[PDB]
C-alpha cells in the first residue's frame with residue numbers, strides 16, 4: 001500500500017494537464033491518475049507510437065499522456081459517445097500545441113466505430129469507457145493490433161455477481177486465454193491490464 | 199492496497215519456477231514476485247527480446263520470466279558475483295528446456311562486467327542486485343540500450359538518510375533527469391522503475 005502511494009505520488013503534471021483535469025471533473029468524466037498517464041506514455045513509446053486508438057476520450061487527460069509518448073507523425077484516434085467531451089479534449093490538445101494532423105476524434109458508440117477501423121493497423125489500443133463493455137472492446141481491440149502492439153485496459157481490477165464485475169472478469173478471461181497475447185496486470189489508478197500481441 | 203494484492207495474486211507459476219524459488223530461499227537470495235515476473239516478460243516482449251542483460255541472476259527466477267518473453271534466437275546475458283547462484287540458475291534454465299545458446303552466464307562483479315558489454319546492443323537491461331549499487335548500474339545500463347530499449351530497476355521504491363536509500367533515490371534521479379529516457383514507476387514487488395530509451 002505504501003508502495004502504491006509512492007508510485008502514484010511519483011509524477012507531477014504541467015498546467016495544460018491541470019486544465020484538462022478541471023474540465024473532466026466539471027463534466028463528471030473520469031480521468032486516469034498521473035501515474036497511470038506516465039505508464040500509458042511509456043507503453044505508447046514501447047509500442048512504436050505511430051497509430052494509437054483510444055476508447056473513451058473524456059476531457060483528454062489520457063490522450064495528452066499517450067501523445068507525449070507517440071511519434072511526431074503519430075496519430076491518436078480517440079472515440080467518445082459525447083461530442084461535448086470531444087470538444088473539451090480537442091481544446092486541451094490545442095492548448096498543448098498538438099498538431100491537428102496528430103489527432104483524429106470520432107463521435108459515436110465505440111462498439112460500432114472500432115469495427116470500421118483497419119485490422120492489424122494500430123500500435124496501441126487503450127480501453128477506458130464503461131467497464132460493462134470491456135469484453136466487446138477487447139475482442140475488437142485485439143483485432144486492430146499489429147504484431148508487437150499493446151492493448152491496455154483501464155479499470156481492470158474493479159459483489160462478485162454484479163453485471164459490471166462479470167464483464168470485467170470476462171474481459172480479463174478473454175485476454176488471459178488468448179494465446180496471441182502476453183499480459184501483465186499493473187496496480188495503478190483503477191488497475192491497468194496490458195498485453196502485447198504476437 | 200487491495201488493488202496491489204489483486205495484481206500480485208493474478209499470476210500462477212509452473213513447477214520449474216517453484217523449484218527455482220525453493221532454491222532461492224535456501225541460498226538466501228531474493229526472487230521477484232510472480233507479478234513482477236509477468237511484467238518483466240511483457241517488457242522483454244515489447245523491447246524486441248533479442249539481447250537482454252540481467253544484473254543479479256539469483257537462482258534464475260527473473261531470468262526464467264524474461265526468457266519466456268524473449269525471442270527463440272534471443273540471448274539472456276545474466277551476471278552474478280556468486281558462482282553458486284549461477285550454477286542454480288543454469289540448472290533451472292536447463293529444467294525449463296532453455297537451449298544453451300539462449301543464455302550467457304557471467305561470473306563476476308557487474309560493475310566491471312557491464313563496462314565490457316557493447317554499447318547500444320541490448321533490448322532490455324534488468325537491474326536486481328544490491329540497491330546501493332543502482333547508480334553505477336543505471337549509468338552503465340543506459341549505455342547498453344539500443345534505441346527503443348528498456349532499462350528496468352527492481353527495488354526502486356525502498357530512514358531517509360540511509361546510504362542505501364540515498365543510492366536508490368540518486369538512481370531514480372539519474373533516470374528522471376535523463377532526457378533520453380521515458381520512465382514509469384510500477385508498484386509491484388519491491389517496486390519496478392522502467393524507462394524506454396530514445
Ligand SMILES: C[S@@+](CC[C@H](N)C(=O)[O-])C[C@H]1O[C@@H](n2cnc3c(N)ncnc32)[C@H](O)[C@@H]1O
Nearest residue numbers: 030031032056058061062080081109110128129
Ligand atoms: C473514464 S471517462 C474517459 C477518461 C479518459 N480516458 C481520460 O483518462 O482522460 C469514460 C468516457 O467514455 C465515454 N463513453 C461511455 N460509453 C461509450 C461508448 N459506448 N462509446 C464511446 N465512448 C463511451 C464517456 O463519454 C466518457 O467520456
Ligand SMILES: C[S@@+](CC[C@H](N)C(=O)[O-])C[C@H]1O[C@@H](n2cnc3c(N)ncnc32)[C@H](O)[C@@H]1O
Nearest residue numbers: 228229230254256259260278279307308326327
Ligand atoms: C535479489 S538477488 C537476484 C534475484 C533474481 N534477480 C531473481 O529475481 O530471481 C541479488 C543477486 O545479486 C548478486 N550480487 C550482489 N552484488 C553483486 C555484484 N556486485 N555484481 C553481480 N551480482 C551481485 C547476488 O549474488 C544475488 O544473487
